[model samples]
Target: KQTRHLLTISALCPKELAYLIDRALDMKKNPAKYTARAANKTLLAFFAKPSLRTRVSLETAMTRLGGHAIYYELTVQDTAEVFSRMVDICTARLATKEMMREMAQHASVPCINALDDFGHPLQMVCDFMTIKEKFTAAGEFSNGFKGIKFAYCGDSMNNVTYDLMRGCALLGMECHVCCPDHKDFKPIKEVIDECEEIIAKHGTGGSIKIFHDCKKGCEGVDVVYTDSWMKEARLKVLTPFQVDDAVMAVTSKRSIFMNCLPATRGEEQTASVIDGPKSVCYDEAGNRLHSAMAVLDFFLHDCK
Candidate 1:
């Protein structure tokens, strides 16, 4: 069988995504059962850009499942082909789309995009896994993810937000991208266009809505998601899009808050809100390990 690579969440069908989520939850519950599934296997982790969550989650998942993950900065031009020979799988957090493609193109083993400028598909999986667990625990969604509403506020231009919106579209969740109307903060035209196309093609019962008002976007949302502002220059202009008490007030009382982490207290979100009762950022972060294990299992073991 050919190795399967996950570069974008949008490339996956709904059934595939659902399977990964289910498997992830199972792994989370019964970690001991799968402990040694990847025994003797090795993963090569190359990061062009640094990340705490991505690096630590992938490493921990690998170790827990009886595998070794070797971390290195991607520097040499011919490194992909060289590393692929020794590893069971390759993973990367790269700076550019071309760099990700180059790494995947030359490697014979399955290559996972830890993150790229274009999107963060692994993070998307971890996020939805967290969402699935939350709703399932609450007795709100027993069958599957449907009719869930996600409001993503602030830094619409962030790659994680781009992937999250795409995940929402693919998984049949109502999504609203809330950002300032200013040119610096608003989502790019290409991303918006692609989101529409993906939603039209893969959306089951979901839809994407763009909003200028943070409160309007949060109204009745099941999940309030935010990410750090990428550009410091846009801080003053994007103030209205921050996830604060006023913004959380517009959401459903049961709404859960999520941030990609390394969040600025007063910038993308307020300290009080992200640390409050509704906040599930830690749980969301924890799901990263399980979800990553699921991804590795699917490609490296199940595929065989």
Candidate 2:
């Protein structure tokens, strides 16, 4: 119980999630203050898939923090326990929750789930960090993200969607997930159930509403988020829900578009939108380094 693992956004309470966002923002402003936080440490960035943002952001974070990160490919060659003895923490991007849990179970050090089929906690941190900066500068920080409308379209079963749902619901925001009502496209039952539990247990005003109508879900929100997961498997079914001009037009004037990157210009959103001034996708990506550093400090500071 002493060991903390960010296997999902569920690992954090609503306030703790806010704390990390603030810390990430702090790190962004006063970068040198936290540089010594992760000094002389080592991070095992283990991955089961390819990456660009995850790798570069983390590599840059470690370098900036005076730490070393080992970008090792996953394998049975050296078990999680074996790797634990070699590094300060394990950051894994696995294919499924079961596989991710097995790594954390055997590893003694703190483990951060870089991404799994279930969630992407680090990316979520970057996202909310971006949102916090924008809203705070706009003088909308009075409510502390409680009543913000966060809408997501396309690939409801995505890892990005799962953690976003948990973060928004936990923080008292109204979350909308718009997608095709298909078994393969809907969010996992466990994630939806967990969000409901947050509402019941915490009595937070936050809520998650499912909507098949894209325009209605995005009608008025502070954020319009999407992902580029329209692969060959479900191209025909997912196309209509794309966040194009029509979808963005329905959003609030102050709303910003976000994609976690590796986004297809013509798929999840139009080039006009993600490339538009309204898009904070680069800010989202930029904050990833800060979030990565904060997360590295989060677990590393505790055990070491």
Candidate 3:
């Protein structure tokens, strides 16, 4: 017998994994056509951090798919007590990986990381799913989807950027990581090393190179992503590296911008870019409902 792996996100999932997520997302968007698909199934979602996108999307997904989702927020000194609960699926948001690991190790249920200091796998999956749908609806789904260079600027070491790098590497997309020359923006080498083999195995050549030049980062990229410079745990670490007009000016015309929710307009991305027509931030946020539901349904019913 083999054990199953749930997503944590800072470590990217491969292209095949992402493609499957897209398929599931399509099913979720039109669930009336796919009714009662996951009856008798359940998922458990937990969040220790404040959330909008990760929480609502996943919760709604579970309900729509005919599966129940149990959400809890661990607010104490540890997750020891929370891990003792019974559930079919567990999603946790935390300030650190150590907290997540404690819960993951303690629980028998499949653990999904809603968000953490490390990764947001569901968010990344939805991001790709939205991009794929965007292209597909346009009848322009050519070129195999891997070479779509994803360039993200802001605090590079933030959960979104960190996972974006891994997701890009895993899914065979070219990724450019850009941020301030500060420790807060520096990536965890261990996480990068862990996914290096997976990226290489897929023949997806990408390097975790850093750039301070937003213009250089945006050069020839298909997507531009940004996020808030201040996450609760990381605000003190990344406040100085604010995003502004200069960064937006460098983006490619064909380039679309994305951001994870709870956005700070003037901090990591400007109102013009985030609210502008080119921004896919809202679509990305809305897709959380579709994407998370897809994830819950896929693991609970589809995968078997």
Residue 117, candidate 3: Cα error in Å is 1.1
Instruction: Assess every candidate by TM-score.
Output: 0.93, 0.95, 0.85
**lDDT-better candidate, 1 vs 2:** 2
Q: State candidate 3's TM-score.
A: 0.85
For 1-304, candidate 3 gives per-residue lDDT tens digits of: 0224355553334644665566656675667864575566666666776587777787777777776767676643234345435455667787787777666665555667777777788887788887777766655558646657777776776777777787777767777777666775766676677557667777767555667766787776777787766427565554444445555566655567788777888677778878887788888888888777766665554353
For candidate 1, write residues 71-187 as lDDT tens digits. Answer: 877554367667767889888888887888877877778888888877888888899999989988898785466767899998787788888877887888889999888776677
Residue 137 in model 2: lDDT = 84
Candidate 1 — which pairs collide? none
lDDT of 2 by residue, 1-304 (tens): 3568999887888777878888889989998787776678899888788788898888888988888899978654258768878789879888888888887877788999998888899998899999989878887778888857999999898888999999888788899999998988888898899999987788878989989878888998889999977438687878878888888999888788889988899888889989987898998898999998888887887421
Off by over 4 Å in 1: 1-3, 75-77, 302-304
Q: Best candidate, lDDT-wise?
A: 2
Worst 10 residues of 2 by lDDT: 72-81
Candidate 3 achieves a global lDDT of 0.68
lDDT of 3 at 85: 53
Give the Cα-based TM-score of candidate 2 against the true structure: 0.95
Estimate the overall C-alpha local distance difference test score of candidate 1. 0.83
